[PDB]
Structure formats: C-alpha cells, structure tokens
C-alpha cells in the first residue's frame, strides 16, 4: 500500500517547500499540518480550475530564496473560462526583522526575545480567480498561520484568512450559495464565527471614498489565536475545504451565459474597482504574510487581465448596475 | 482697457479658489503669483488639449471643503485623441495637522510653532494625459508650492514639481524633443538643474521589482528652497510654460499614426505598468500636496481608460518591445 504522506504529496502541484525529511519527522507539528493543508488546498483548487478551463495550462513555479523562504506559484492566464487565475503558497522561516517586530508592537503584540532573536515561521495560501464571463464572479481567498518562538518554551501563534466574492452584477442565488457554503463551514466550529467574520469581511474590503465594498463579502478573520491551536486549525481546514464547493459551481453555471458588450463594459469597470482597492487602501506591506495587508507579490498575482476606469453617469434606478452599487454601499445578509 | 488681473482670469477654466478680493490686495505675494501660475497652466494645457480633441468636452468642477481647501478639476474622457486627460489644481489653507507636522520632522524638517499652530498654504497643479493612439505618449506633470508660518516672522517654503513622458514604444525624435524642451527651460536658470533633475526623475519613477522605470523620465524636483523664492518661482514658471511645447507637438504628430492590434495590446500592457507604479510604490499619502507621493485624488485622476496585465514572453531581441524595455531598465541621455 502507498505511504500516506507519499500519497498526499503525489497530488500536490509541486513538492513541499519544506524538506520532506523534516515533515516526516514531525507529523504532529502545526507547521507540518498547515503546510500540508495549504498544499492540498492549492492542488484542489488548481485541479478544479483546470477541469473547467480547457483553454490554458497552469505554469507551476516552485521557488526559494535565502532570506525570503520559498513557495509555489501556480498561474493560469487568458483561458477560455478564466482570464487570470493565481493560486500561490509561501513558507518562510527565519528570525523576525527588527522592522517586522516593531510593527507587531504597534498592533499591541508583545514579543519576548529568545536569546537575542525571534525565530518564526509564516505560511499561507492565497488566490485570486477572475473569470472571463461578466456573469461568472471573481473570488479571492487566503489562509495563513504564523508562529514565533519567545523566551521560555513559549510560542505566540495566530491564524488568518478569508474568502470573498466580487460579482460583476448581483445574482441572488449565487450570493446565497457562496455565503451558505461559508456559514456551514464556520458553524461546525461555533455559531458566532460566521456572523463575526461576515461583518469583518464587509468592513475590511471597503473602498472608502466611494462608500462601496469591493464585492459581496464572505468571511474575513485575523489574529485568530483562541481557543486552542488544534481547534483553530480545524476551523481553518474547514474554511479551506469550502473554497471549491463555494465557487466552482457558480463558474460552471455561468461561464457560458450570454452577455452584451455593455455587460462586458460593466465587468471591466468592476475589475477596475477590484484593482483600486489595492491602489488606494492596500498598496503593499512587506509583512503581509502574517498581518492584514497584501505583499507586492500578492497584489501582482491579483491583477485581472484587463480593467477599465471611467466616471459614470448614475445608472437607471431599477437597473442591475444600480442594484449592485446599492449592495456594495449597503451590504445585505445572505444566509441566516 | 481691460484690467490686467480681470483679463488673466477670463482665460482660466474657472474662477480662482482664493477670493479674488484677496488676490487683488496682495499681487506681490508668492501665494498670489503661484495661484495665478497654476490657473494659467491649467488653462493653457486644457485649451491645447481641447483644440486637438474634438471628440469630448472638459467637465470643469470648481469645488471647496471646510477642512480640505478648494480646487478646480478638469476632466476629459473617451475622446477621439485622448482616452483620459485630467488637469487639476488645489489650494489649501489652514493649520498643519499634528500628523502632517510629525511626518515632516521624519524627513528632517524642523518647524517652530507660531502661537500653538503652524499656519500653512499648499497649492499645485497636476495632470496626467493618456492618448488613445499607441504611438502618442502619456505625459504627467505637476508643479506645487508650500509655505508654513513659524515662530517670529519666519516662513519655511519650498517648491516641487516635474514633467515626465511614458511612451508605449520608444521614438527617438519624440524623446529628444521632450527632453530638449525641458532642458532649455531649466538651462535658463542654471546649467546644473536639468542634469540633476533628469537623474532624479530616472531614479524616482522606478518600478523596483521589474527593474524598470515607468517611462523615459524628464525632470523631477522636490524640496526646492534655494536660492531665493522669486528665483525658484521663475524657474517653476519656465517649467510650467514648457509643458505644452514639450508635448502637444508629439500628440499632433502621432495621433493619426496607423497601429496594429499587437501595438494596441502593448500599449495596454504599458498602461498597466503606469498603474502598477501607484499600486506598488505610490499608493496614496494624505500629505502628497507638499511632499513626494500622490494623494488618492491624484492617483484616481491618473488612471487610464483601460489597462492590461499579463506575464509576457521575452520579446524578439531586436523588436521595438525589447528596445523600450531596455531603455526602461537602463535610461539614456537624450540631450546634452
């Protein structure tokens, strides 16, 4: 019979960033469990996307750097269903830079150095998928884990993540399906998680000057460090496993929908909004792998194939354009 | 005979931000001279653009806010020559916020409060113009002035500005024309200004991760506070007056050039680079009206009508695509 770990690894997009000998020695370490989870998630998502899109192949770049860890970047471009799809993982080990350390103190985190250093590990998966068809929505997700070794055998750790949808026009069934899938995943771990993280997602992706959100939300969480490491991992695992069922059915349903040049135009304006969230409010932080805010590499991976920016006459009062603008300004409940 | 100031004002896009009664009382104040210069420049540029583009009209929005000063924003969109053109002016009076003050100290500026306050005035013009034709280049320019009243009758003041070109493909004649026009303007005020500011421009618009500049540069200067206020103003005035001759001839020459769908595609990728400079390296600073870095309003005004982002096969070794990439990576002299 095939070795359990070997079997898992044959299904990944590329070999793990961490030496397989190390993962084999420490199967129960959260760093091991989380690296395998992010690799699994990346593979599950890429496989689902590749099954849907016959028009392009993933390029898979497993990379490493001396100071910047390693990762696996999977990119699909200009396919028949997806104009852009990126699914990346990163794993970084090292000692925290004085700058990184300083920033955490500003957010109220107190780190006690071990020797003179702060050994740490940060890892995560992050993805942005932009369909070609105006009626097939964009998705973003990310799931990550951080630990830092302090004085004594004490460790400080936390998880972060989220999954959010950016439709061109509102589709009620799609919105409910997406949110319901996320809520079911969260509810397994406690009834207050989805409502909290749904609200957090509505608040976080706010393009402030327009008074509009990027999309229809989903879930967002950060600094998640209770009740226990294993319990939070199981929650994150449920969330990561919800991505494909939350999303691929929407793309399969809508990828062939007819659309007008005007609907395509509107899609392009909505894609410009997606980009603008970064331009104005999330331009790049070097420490983005373990705090809210994106690293440059992530921002680049998120860009669509094309976008449009143009000052727009208020749309007809009962138009689909007006409807989506209203919900971006005033988010709604989708599941209770 | 028409009143000199009234005659000047009839040529502006809208009335000055500052009460005309105040400008009339203090004709010799640098705030007056600079406000008139920025209004003149805005009008000269808009008039030149409107003469070239019969396909769209400028919308002119003269606005004010209680805490945020006032301005005049002129916008043209989706014309027959320009896909986007923005020419804005802002004039803000008030007392420096503790945050703004703090930032200046970080840059090594030392301000001595008058009473408990730092009364200040900041003003400027800023513009981004994106032609439709791949062969007609994008331009950006800005010219600004800041003063703050300190303890005693002492004032701290400085100017900043620049003018830079972002071609889709390199055209040697265009590059020389543009740079020559700027150099002639600078040289009138001293022989070391153009070489210094040309290099500064090459260094500033560096999209670091690609190792490429946004375009072919021009001039860039900041914190310009010597030799005297009148001398620096006259220099800035020469630079502002060089915009139209540096640029409009290039648009008139190339706006009708034939282009291929591939050249249009490349233009779209170059426009994506333009946007990416903000996304990564210049995302927004609230204090951008008096320091390097753009305010959100400026970033928005700069966005093109459309852009593209796509990971690209290295172009043919002697292609025009390869040539522009090489010069973006390794800037050249254009005039000596």
From Swiss-Prot, chains A, B:
Modified residues (N6-succinyllysine): 286
Entry GO MF terms: coproporphyrinogen oxidase activity; protein homodimerization activity; structural constituent of eye lens
Binding site for coproporphyrinogen III: 126, 142-144, 293-295
Active site: 140 (proton donor)
GO cellular component annotations of the record: cytoplasm; cytosol; mitochondrial inner membrane; mitochondrial intermembrane space; mitochondrion
Main subcellular location of this protein, as a coarse class: mitochondrion
Membrane-spanning segments: none
Site (Important for dimerization): 209
Disease: Hereditary coproporphyria: A form of porphyria. Porphyrias are inherited defects in the biosynthesis of heme, resulting in the accumulation and increased excretion of porphyrins or porphyrin precursors. They are classified as erythropoietic or hepatic, depending on whether the enzyme deficiency occurs in red blood cells or in the liver. Hereditary coproporphyria is an acute hepatic porphyria characterized by skin photosensitivity, attacks of abdominal pain, neurological disturbances, and psychiatric symptoms.
Quaternary data: Homodimer.
Protein name (database record): Oxygen-dependent coproporphyrinogen-III oxidase, mitochondrial
Gene label: CPOX
